[PDB]
Symmetry: C2
Subunit: 544 residues, 2 copies
């Protein structure tokens, strides 16, 4: 045997525990200190290519959503020259990184996970709160738990993947080499989860790829924090290039490179489609066929059957619809309620609604949710609330007020539609706006079909019911309406390794980050067969 | 639990040789009228076509027809109507259809599918055996195993919630477009997605219609319900235009030319706003495969392995060796032996003469394309035909094996896929082996198969590293063809396709779109959090 293959080991990981932040607790004190550390501060965040900090003339600012007078970061957009230089340098670093043992690459992410878990936790939480407007618990489940879990679980999945080997029969030995993709990957991340940015850039890097990471403008502060932690954890230069940029410019540049091998995208449907078309237009230029991965949002439902637990419906719906101001691709924005339960549910929703506190998440930990992300989001939500007032089929039951004088503040809003096909039942708002449709109990089956057919999306959904037969029926009927389906729980809050996340229809390519197969999109395997005996004649015995 | 199907020896007086000879006699002089099949309906259009026996083109082995746009659209509608129930079936129940089909192919139907592959596609006994029997049987058994085991891949549950992954088929229909050169590939392209709960429009290759329909009928007989796989031969562009125009397209499983795959990819992109979801394109697109020889190589192995790789089935494999790199020190040996063995190759009727090494190429178009390359080899200042090159299409599409030396390592013939029995050899100076390895990697647009012959461990290690992306199926001291399911999952990148590795455990993942279900068994409680108090 001329090729010697070293045995592969296993890795033990578990989900990162969620902290409680009780009064007087070390994590609460640490977080308050980290928040104080950001008050009045603006970080100047450069593009990073290799180890070089680069500034262009295209200066941009990230504002604190709940206090937009506070510029939390000054950054810049990479120009096309810098993006191309970043590509060249990444490509020149790629072969060495790809040849590194999987275990050695995994170690970088395991180190980073430990840093985030401990000494850097308060920092990434605070930067996510101040820069993206998250409350303590929303930052904790995101910038700490989910990001840490992505890093640890993907490391486990990747190390274990090398143990997936083919059959060998004499006189030959077969081995699969899990190559990174030949070229570079473009990672394009969204504002709403710090963890997503880390995963979009980090997972391909783990698999031996090199990456140009364009982070979200409105999440720049936390994103750079994560980038620095990766570098400190031992990520070599030119493996992930930190290149904020104008979206169209970035897409134009990466899709014009013969060396593009993948785009890992989370964001709007039209932008993903645009990139898909650009790659198609440029097919004859590429050295290989680029792999596009996209997660693209939803119009997610909570469906209530007459047998539902009312209290669970209420609390689960309030959380799903309004946590982080409803700015989740998984947030519930349509609630279907049977007539029989509407009196109870409506009463309870309105009462609980009046107790929801909207405000500054850094100064007041009593805050349930804070301002929406930016002026553009605020303007869009304003238009939908105006639509609700104008539309004869819509009625605002609670909330409906807004104020952008200090932050981009929007009250949680509950709207009733008499029309199950109203535009507000179909279009993703990405704001704290829940629409309710009340259906006659005996039409629950017909209404389940409407849940399935009304929107273009297939991301998340929940059924609330205590009747087993009903749960089985609804589970069958709604099979393609939700890639993450919930029985008697809210439609948000997927946990890595427990609810791998993603959906189809217009919601994306459904590669299930958070599960064991996601990493397979970022490797292009090679199989090597070594034969240990001479071949013999070209003829076969049957020919004699 | 599954193992590879045994490859039979077909010795004189063996049961399999007797059975095959009978099956060949069963086809002599026969033309099968093969309809389009939509559900259980046998449909005929006026667009009548014929499949000819490559080595005796006067023999029309099948009459079939092209589905028109209207028929293809009906096939889509009927398939979509059957999909929900099929997808709702337990994975094991779907797997059973393929396991039954595999047993049928292994036993009572083996001679039939071999014979139809020999007569219809021009394969010899052993080429038909490794394809229509072993490879197809293995695809069915191994994919069934992988699929049943995939359901065991489940997430973590923590009280008071239970999490379960449902491996849904893709929502919509999948278009499967298969090539002439392996009966097994057609079975896999249509079969693998169907196994995973999809419904499929299968456009089989015109020039493999007889064997393709045989496989189709076996699947139906094995229990495949109506409208899960529609059997729809069609004009290539018409089929492509029709399926990419449907809002319900969810995947294309393709094996064929780069330009055709690129065209389909562009059609899907043009129509993105029409589709209910993002279609998944899988393409296996050929190669320009190498055998690289180091001075330490076992010459006998180089010779036999290269003759087989380059010439078996007339070189009509995406994995076939078409460029051979030889060090000057070994050239007199290798040249002498290749030319001597070349004279002993028998090209002829594989049904009538089991002495035949390989037979006619597939059709008139292939014959014409290969002739163009031979004419180029007779023209180019850097090329010399050392042996072979003769051709005669009077009775069958017969092209003799041809061995060419190129003085130019980057001549067009070193770069472009011919799909015929045409081997080009480049002789390199021993001291320039490293420079030449770089040329192996940089010369072509392809990344499919390649082999290094060497007995020096350090050389093998170096060559393996340098050629990491030059071949997705890489061979040390073996020929570049003949991948076996479960042993060498098959595929490569660069221009050679999307590399989804059919034959390995991950291929089926392209044909499922998972759903995760979380059920919580306790009431939720307050929406507030303790830290907020």
């Amino acid at each position: 045997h001329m090729l010697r293959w070293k045995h592969t080991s296993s890795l033990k990981v578990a989900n990162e525990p969620i902290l409680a932040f009780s009064q007087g607790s070390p994590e609460r004190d640490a977080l308050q200190k980290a928040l104080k550390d950001l008050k009045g501060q603006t970080e100047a965040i450069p593009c990073v290519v290799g180890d070089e900090e680069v500034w262009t003339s295209d200066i941009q600012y990230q504002l604190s959503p709940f206090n937009h007078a506070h510029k939390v970061a000054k950054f810049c957009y990479a120009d096309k020259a810098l993006l191309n230089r970043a590509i060249d340098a990444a490509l020149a670093a790629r072969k060495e990184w790809d040849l590194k043992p999987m275990a050695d690459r995994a170690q970088v992410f395991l180190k980073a996970a430990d840093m985030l878990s401990g000494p850097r936790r308060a920092e990434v939480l605070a930067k996510t709160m101040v820069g993206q407007g998250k409350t303590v618990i929303q930052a904790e489940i995101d910038a700490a738990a989910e990001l840490i879990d992505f890093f640890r679980f993907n490391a486990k999945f990747a190390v274990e993947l090398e143990g997936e080997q083919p059959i060998s029969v004499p006189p030959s030995t077969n081995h699969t080499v899990y190559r990174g993709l030949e070229g570079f990957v473009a990672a394009i991340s969204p504002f709403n989860f710090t963890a997503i940015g880390g995963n979009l850039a980090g997972a391909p890097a783990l698999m031996g790829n090199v990456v140009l990471w364009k982070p979200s403008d409105t999440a720049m502060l936390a994103s750079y924090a994560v980038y620095r932690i990766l570098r400190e954890a031992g990520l070599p230069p030119n493996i992930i290039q930190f290149v904020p940029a104008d979206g169209p410019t970035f897409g134009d540049t990466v899709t014009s490179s013969e060396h593009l091998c993948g785009i890992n995208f989370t964001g709007s449907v039209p932008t993903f489609k645009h990139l898909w078309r650009q790659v198609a237009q440029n097919l004859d230029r590429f050295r290989t066929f680029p792999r596009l991965a996209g997660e693209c949002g939803g119009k997610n439902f909570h469906f209530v059957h007459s047998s539902a637990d009312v209290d669970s419906v209420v609390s689960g719906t309030l959380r799903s619809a309004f946590e982080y101001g409803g700015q989740k691709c998984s947030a519930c924005s349509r609630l279907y309620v049977p007539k029989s339960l509407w009196p109870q549910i409506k009463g309870r929703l309105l009462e609980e609604h009046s107790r929801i506190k909207v405000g500054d998440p850094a100064e007041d930990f009593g805050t349930f949710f804070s301002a929406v992300i930016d002026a553009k989001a605020f303007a869009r939500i304003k238009k939908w609330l105006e639509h609700a007032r104008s539309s004869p089929s819509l009625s605002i039951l609670a909330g409906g007020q807004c104020n952008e004088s200090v932050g981009y503040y929007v009250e949680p809003c509950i709207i009733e539609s008499k029309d199950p096909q109203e535009p507000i039942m179909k279009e993703e708002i990405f704001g704290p706006v829940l629409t309710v449709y009340v259906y006659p109990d005996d039409k629950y089956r017909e209404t389940l079909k409407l849940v399935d057919s009304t929107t273009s999306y297939g991301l998340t959904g929940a059924v609330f019911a205590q009747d087993k037969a009903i749960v089985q029926e609804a589970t069958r009927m709604l099979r393609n309406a939700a890639g993450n389906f919930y029985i008697n729980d809210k439609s948000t809050g997927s946990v890595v390794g427990q609810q791998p996340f993603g959906g189809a229809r217009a919601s994306g390519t459904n590669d299930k980050p958070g599960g064991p197969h996601y990493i397979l999109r970022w490797t292009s395997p090679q199989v090597i067969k070594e034969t240990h005996k001479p071949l013999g004649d070209w003829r076969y015995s049957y020919m004699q």
